[PDB]
Amino acid sequence: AAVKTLNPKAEVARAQAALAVNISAARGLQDVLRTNLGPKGTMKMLVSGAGDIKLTKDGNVLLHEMQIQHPTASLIAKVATAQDDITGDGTTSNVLIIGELLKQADLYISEGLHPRIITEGFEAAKEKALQFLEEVKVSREMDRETLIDVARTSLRTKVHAELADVLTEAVVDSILAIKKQDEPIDLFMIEIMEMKHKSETDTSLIRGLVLDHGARHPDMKKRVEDAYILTCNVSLEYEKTEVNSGFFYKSAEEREKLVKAERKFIEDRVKKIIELKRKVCGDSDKGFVVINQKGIDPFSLDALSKEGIVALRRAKRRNMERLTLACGGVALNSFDDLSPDCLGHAGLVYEYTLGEEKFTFIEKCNNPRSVTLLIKGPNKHTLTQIKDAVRDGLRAVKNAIDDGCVVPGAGAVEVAMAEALIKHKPSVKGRAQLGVQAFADALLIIPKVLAQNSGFDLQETLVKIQAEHSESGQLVGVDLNTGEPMVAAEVGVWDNYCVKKQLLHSCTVIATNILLVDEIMRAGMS
């Protein structure tokens, strides 16, 4: 072709070649991801090049872990990655709707219709679908029951059913705990710690914090009941001078004096801590826990142990905020003027050893605006799966809270939007009615795949559901256990309005751009 006359080692896909390539890759991705959809979906096992195992049903994880080197697949993976970064859910449905839009558009483009006209119809249908979505969204007071139904709707798709019944309460309580009225939810304030010793149904919500380290002095207590928490960011180990200094002495006695003196600077901070401890705990009734974002040398650790303080070192820059929000003190970068008001309270602090690692629990706080989810499980891959699931569930509940509206699930909104688009089609001018029809039949891929995965006839189930929705007008979806139509709003199967809107927008746009691609070209080689 033209490009190969200038760069002989160039690869080129023109007009029909380009479209066939892109649609084929999209349909391949769709064929892989069709099985992820819904609670009746199948778990995939993924083995890295090192031999590491991942068990996932998550569309984004599956995408990034699959072994693919296709440009269209890269485009769609990036669109799904954005969907996940912003909403946390919707990647599988995103890929499926993209693939189905491309297929339904190829159906008409093979018959000589222009992709520009198909994309115009796509744009019209997108507009009408966004309108219908805004119309059908259910504005609801976000109560614990609604949030529980939402988090269940996500976790039951992502993990096993009993583990979903546990993680639902865990996630909803965590969000209802770190949430302040009319103030965007900072999900950073929900720590997620994994422990690898017990069953997966032991995953719980600690109304406090769990640090992945403990005290490094053996004489330090392993359990403290009524603890003053000092969150600090002050080095308690030996610090050398910025300017190169060095010590000069003429006698072993002078060397000894200099050895005792060189630590006075850090001894003073230890003395400040110890004096605060003595001033706030006049006896051994209460406890005192220092948590330092920086180091603590053995001398300081010994000095604090002698006074009965539990010192943890090299905490996390996020744990500074998490501790000041859970306990309720002030995080310090200096001990210039520290006061008892700088301290937090924890009604219990103790340590838990698991093989070679130690954990520190900080619980019984008063009203912690920061909590942690302790992911317990017997395997690293189980823990990873639960981590992904709780990410999905947290994003789901956060979005349901932010957008006080919530949309019915189980393909109900997709069916209804298809019907609305098909009734709207005549109002579209020209052969963009075919693009509208393609958009509608593409939206209809969610109930189709749900039925396919529950083990039902796609056409029969979809005709039943569309008939019920046209006869009654109720937003109805797939019952994955009987294949019958069911009212998602009545049975508690809810999706995120933000997720559906992002689906419509991003899927329409990327499908339009792919359809309008007319030449794939690799010519960067020297």
Next chain:
Amino acid sequence: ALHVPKAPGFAQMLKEGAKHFSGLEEAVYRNIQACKELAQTTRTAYGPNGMNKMVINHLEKLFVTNDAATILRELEVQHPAAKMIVMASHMQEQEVGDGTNFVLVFAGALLELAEELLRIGLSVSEVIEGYEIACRKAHEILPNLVCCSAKNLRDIDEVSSLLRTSIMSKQYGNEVFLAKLIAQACVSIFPDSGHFNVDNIRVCKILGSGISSSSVLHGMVFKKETEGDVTSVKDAKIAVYSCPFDGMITETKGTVLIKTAEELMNFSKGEENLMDAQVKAIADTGANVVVTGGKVADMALHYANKYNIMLVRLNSKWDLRRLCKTVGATALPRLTPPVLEEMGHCDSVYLSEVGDTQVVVFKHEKEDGAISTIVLRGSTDNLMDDIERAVDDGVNTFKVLTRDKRLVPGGGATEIELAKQITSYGETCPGLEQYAIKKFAEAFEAIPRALAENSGVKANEVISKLYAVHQEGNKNVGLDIEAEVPAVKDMLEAGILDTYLGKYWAIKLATNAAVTVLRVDQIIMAKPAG
């Protein structure tokens, strides 16, 4: 995302080294580019001022010529569209013998203008329609452009003046001599019947001297020697045998079965007496020259020498047949003496030495016969081969004149008149066909343009002068190569003329080749073997 995959379908099912081109860009334009490159390779050889090329083929053989069809044959053209244009040029060479370079130039021009029209927005179908209607108009016009006719092909001055033009493009410096030679030969072998055979003009290329020492010979020349002792004969009574000059033997295995000392003693003497009887019967028929297509036996040669017979051995069977045509004899498959009709006659048969080469000459004295030979002298084998090609051009022109005696003016005069008239026809023809008609017309301008460029003058000034004179009314005016500046003159009065049939067939074949190249839309090459 670092590799573009082959699209599903034909792109994947295609074999390893196979190629597939489709559409105006990948197929049509690339074919037009290939044919344009071909026309460019052969353009600088067009006309009397055309320069020669020295093509070396894969066999390390050297060809020095400005004959388009020869150059094409000796080039290894590998692009299929160019191959098709070459097929057209070779068909022109076969049908007419001259005009291959016209075919190339015109086809390349038609294809360039077709590319232009496709770029301005016409469809290959419309271009082809317009090209076909314009070729039809050109064929309708040319008979009216015919200016003179031969009026006599038994003369030698008229025939020489007629062949001079065809033998001017090749061998421009020395064309009057060559036209004299070829006219002498053609009118010698031209029979009272209107049929003329080009194979009856033989060409003998002998090393030494130069083209001004070339001559015509009413008879035949063979780079052979005589088998026997006799070398000259003045009243030849030639007897021709397709069989060897030996005793006939059985086609089934023969065995000499001896059973007695007498048979053993007498066998060889009987064999020799038999051979003596055979050759004496041949000599007594009056034959003084015997020509055998097979081998000669020692005893038969002995007795031919005894009875004073000149023996000649022609290895080739075409050589034997042509000698028979020359002398009026019949090849006898048996060694039986020939009857009065089976014998041939020549006013002389002798052995001569032209240069280093020894030759046997069957020479008639009469200025006629069935075969004539042109003995080409020259200082180089390549030069003599080029002069032989020029001779072939002249002889094929003579045959074209025997077929159709009509002549059109050369030096671009007919081309300019055709361009003008077809432009005037396209200006009246409405619809999208007028663009293609006008481009077909402008294509004719490529001929005087190529003539001018090789003459060494400004082709645009030449073409403007020609258009002006043909507008004022002179249809026989073409360009003057004997002018350092752009000039023009009366092609008829100058005697520069082409053959109606030559132009007719050249136009037809060039148009058909271009139209086929355009009709191609997809190309599926296979993996080049090797």
Next chain:
Amino acid sequence: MMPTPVILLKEGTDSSQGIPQLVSNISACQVIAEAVRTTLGPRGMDKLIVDGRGKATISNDGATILKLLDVVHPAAKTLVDIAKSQDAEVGDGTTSVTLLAAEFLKQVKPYVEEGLHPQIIIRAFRTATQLAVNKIKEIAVTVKKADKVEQRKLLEKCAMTALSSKLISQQKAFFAKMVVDAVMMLDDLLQLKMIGIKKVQGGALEDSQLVAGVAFKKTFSYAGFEMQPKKYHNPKIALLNVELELKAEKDNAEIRVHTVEDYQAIVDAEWNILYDKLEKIHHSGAKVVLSKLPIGDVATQYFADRDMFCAGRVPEEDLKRTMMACGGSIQTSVNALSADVLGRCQVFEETQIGGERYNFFTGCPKAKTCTFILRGGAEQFMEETERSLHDAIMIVRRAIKNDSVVAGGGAIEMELSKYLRDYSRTIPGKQQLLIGAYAKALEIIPRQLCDNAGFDATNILNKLRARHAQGGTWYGVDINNEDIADNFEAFVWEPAMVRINALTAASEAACLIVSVDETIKNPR
């Protein structure tokens, strides 16, 4: 100059086009000329070339040298071809032709570089060639006396000139007399196969000789050949194409007998067949017997007992020469051996010639054939002697057929250069330059003579240009005096056809090379 998915020609096709290609062709021709320049003239040198097999050839002959050079340049092959053509048509001038062609090309090289149209150049070349040829034909000296002594003087002088460039120049009078006797004793056809040239290693050039007869080397004698005599004083000679030995009467012949009497009869019958052939040959009176076919030991001993001479496997050419010399015919049958078919010489002998034995037929008065016997100290010595004698013989033949002589040493070239300068000063001015270049090119022959001799070609050419414009046409280079001289009086004579064909061939080669504007090499 851009890549294409499918290329017009086969990958590897090298096309050189334009003024650079033409100038490169001219340069290649200059190289080819340089390869032979130093062989020109009496002070010319020989070249030693060696093949892949390691066999060396030593030659002064330009045609030979250029055939041996494995020239592959398509334009430089043309000079080799025209040297071949000159050796064919004339037999001398092979170096001159190449020098002249290359010098024409060199002289027109500047105008080619400055864009002068090759058609114009070739037109000028053709014009000047026709003029020079007609001028040679006009001023060539042709004595119209048909005197035999003057025609032998003429042939001897032309042969001495043709030989005054070889390694036999110190014996050129000797060898010229011999060459002249040879071509004057040939028949009207002047066949080259009728002059035999034997090369017997050993001996001196002056020990070489010409035999007014025929001579050939002894051919694989059997037992009894030494019992045969070796000198005959008036022998009759049987020339045969007959195998004389006990052999299968025929190859497809099968004898079948069922009796021992018939067996013995058959044996004796074979013997009687042979003996009858031998008895016919003996009764024909022939005392010498030559056969193109083998003569067995039985026949050898038969002839030895009859005191006859026999030689078998004699080569066909030597047999034909013996026939043309002694005056008989070659017989495939021995059944009619009449005196008309027998040959005759005054003396037959077998002598020793430098390690080899040679049969001599001498005394044939009706001989239309002669045989050269060349001596020398090396195979290549004798080969270059043979080539020199071939040059001289071809010269003498052409002179016999047309005794029209011009002078050498560059006299004729200087005369033609003067005439062409004169003619060019009378024409418009474009052809003027090219014909003047032709004229200046013609001066390459005396210039190269002076170069190879070790003179100042500039001063000598000034002298010649001056003396040819004052009146005087046969003034050329005098080699032994390092000066000029009237070469027609010095007897440096050259048949006109030599220079006529030299100019014709050189001009044709130049016109061809200059008409080529593109070279296209296909891949092998």
